Each structure stands twice: as structure tokens, then as C-alpha cells.
Amino acid sequence: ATLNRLREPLLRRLSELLDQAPEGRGWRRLAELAGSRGRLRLSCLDLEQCSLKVLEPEGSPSLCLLKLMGEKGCTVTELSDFLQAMEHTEVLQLLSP
Amino acid sequence: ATLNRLREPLLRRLSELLDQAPEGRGWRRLAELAGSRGRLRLSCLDLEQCSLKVLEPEGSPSLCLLKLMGEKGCTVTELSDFLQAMEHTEVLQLLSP
Structure with missing residues (x-):
């Protein structure tokens, strides 16, 4: 199933954790990656x-x-x-120059 | 010279006109184009x-x-x-399908 249909406690928890993630792996970077790597x-x-x-x-x-x-x-x-x-x-x- | 160094009345006027432009040729589309077509x-x-x-x-x-x-x-x-x-x-x- 799709993320928007996940049980609403679990989706809450996912969003809290992503909100707490550092800048390098935060929601903006997630959007960046999903917006270029998939047809999404x-x-x-x-x-x-x-x-x-x-x-x-x-x-x-x-x-x-x-x-x-x-x-x-x-x-x-x-x-x-x-x-x-x-x-x-x-x-x-x-690690890249 | 660069846009940020333009005489401040002229820069005002440019920004007003762009603010009034339609969605298809607005500031967001300008950013879209300048952010992909140049090293900017x-x-x-x-x-x-x-x-x-x-x-x-x-x-x-x-x-x-x-x-x-x-x-x-x-x-x-x-x-x-x-x-x-x-x-x-x-x-x-x-004009594109």
C-alpha cells in the first residue's frame, strides 16, 4: 500500500523521525532524491x-x-x-573531492 | 553590470512587471529556466x-x-x-501534444 494509506500512528512516527533527521538526510533531501530518481x-x-x-x-x-x-x-x-x-x-x- | 547593482528604480520596475506577469512566464518559471539553462x-x-x-x-x-x-x-x-x-x-x- 501507499504511504498516505499507512496506519496513521505509523505514519506519524515515520514523519517524526524524518523531522528529526539531520539536514543531509532530511525531508528536503528525501524530496530531492524521490523527485529525480523515480517517475515521482x-x-x-x-x-x-x-x-x-x-x-x-x-x-x-x-x-x-x-x-x-x-x-x-x-x-x-x-x-x-x-x-x-x-x-x-x-x-x-x-568522500568526494 | 549585474541585476542586483541596477539603479534601484529600474530594478523596482522590473520586479513589478515580473510580479504582474502570468503564471506561464512568472518569477517561478524564470527561476526554473535560469536554474537549468545556465551555471546559475x-x-x-x-x-x-x-x-x-x-x-x-x-x-x-x-x-x-x-x-x-x-x-x-x-x-x-x-x-x-x-x-x-x-x-x-x-x-x-x-503547441506540443
């Missing part, structure tokens, strides 16, 4: 709408992003693939 | 900072964008090249 396409405007969530008392840009990716077809295993690609590309970029 | 690179975060300008009483996202492009080296003639490329690509996309 995000514009700057979508990212903006998610970014504004932080203005709500306990708002989550990662919750917005994950739901949007799910609506665009992303599944849990696809998200996991994306996150480990994030890890690999981060360390490869650190 | 804008992130979604820069565009976000410009987008937030509209929250100021008479604020201008195009003013922010044009200054940022100038700081990154864009000249007046380069901006004109970008704007006419905007026109051409818009009409080519309308």
Missing part, C-alpha cells in the same frame, strides 16, 4: 506547502511530504530504498 | 525565501529573485535572453 515528480511549490507546516503548533513538513509521496504512488519498500540511497549518496559526497 | 543554480530554499516576500505589505518575490540572480552574476542582457526563452518555451509547450 515534486515541484518547488509542493515542497513549499510542506515547509509551511512548521508554522502550525506541532506541524510536520515530513508528514506532508510522506503523504504527498504516497498519493503519488510511493510504497513503504520504495521509501526504504530512497532512505538508504540518501545514506549512500551522503557518504559518497562527503 | 537556485535551490527550492532560495525560491522559498523569495516566495515569502508576498507576506510583507507591498513585498515582491520577483525583486528577491532578480537580486539573487544578479548576486549570482546575471546581467541585464542575460535576463532578456531568459525572458525571451520563457516566451518561446511557453508557446512551444502550448
Whole structure:
């Protein structure tokens, strides 16, 4: 099933963890990677709408992003693939001149 | 000279006109084109900072964008090249299936 259809506690938890992740592997980098590596396409405007969530008392840009990716077809295993690609590309970029 | 060093009345006027342009040839499309066609690179975060300008009483996202492009080296003639490329690509996309 797609991320936006995940049980709502689990999706909450995913979004909290991604919200706490460092800049190099945060929701913006996740959007960057999913918007270039798959047929899933995000514009700057979508990212903006998610970014504004932080203005709500306990708002989550990662919750917005994950739901949007799910609506665009992303599944849990696809998200996991994306996150480990994030890890690999981060360390490869650190080691690159 | 660069856009951010233009006389400040002229830069005002450029930004007002771009702010009034339609969606197909607006400041977001200008950023899109300049961020892919030249070595000038804008992130979604820069565009976000410009987008937030509209929250100021008479604020201008195009003013922010044009200054940022100038700081990154864009000249007046380069901006004109970008704007006419905007026109051409818009009409080519309308005529494309």
C-alpha cells in the first residue's frame, strides 16, 4: 500500500523521525532524491506547502511530504530504498573531492 | 553590470512587471529556466525565501529573485535572453501534444 494509506500512528512516527533527521538526510533531501530518481515528480511549490507546516503548533513538513509521496504512488519498500540511497549518496559526497 | 547593482528604480520596475506577469512566464518559471539553462543554480530554499516576500505589505518575490540572480552574476542582457526563452518555451509547450 501507499504511504498516505499507512496506519496513521505509523505514519506519524515515520514523519517524526524524518523531522528529526539531520539536514543531509532530511525531508528536503528525501524530496530531492524521490523527485529525480523515480517517475515521482515534486515541484518547488509542493515542497513549499510542506515547509509551511512548521508554522502550525506541532506541524510536520515530513508528514506532508510522506503523504504527498504516497498519493503519488510511493510504497513503504520504495521509501526504504530512497532512505538508504540518501545514506549512500551522503557518504559518497562527503568522500568526494 | 549585474541585476542586483541596477539603479534601484529600474530594478523596482522590473520586479513589478515580473510580479504582474502570468503564471506561464512568472518569477517561478524564470527561476526554473535560469536554474537549468545556465551555471546559475537556485535551490527550492532560495525560491522559498523569495516566495515569502508576498507576506510583507507591498513585498515582491520577483525583486528577491532578480537580486539573487544578479548576486549570482546575471546581467541585464542575460535576463532578456531568459525572458525571451520563457516566451518561446511557453508557446512551444502550448503547441506540443
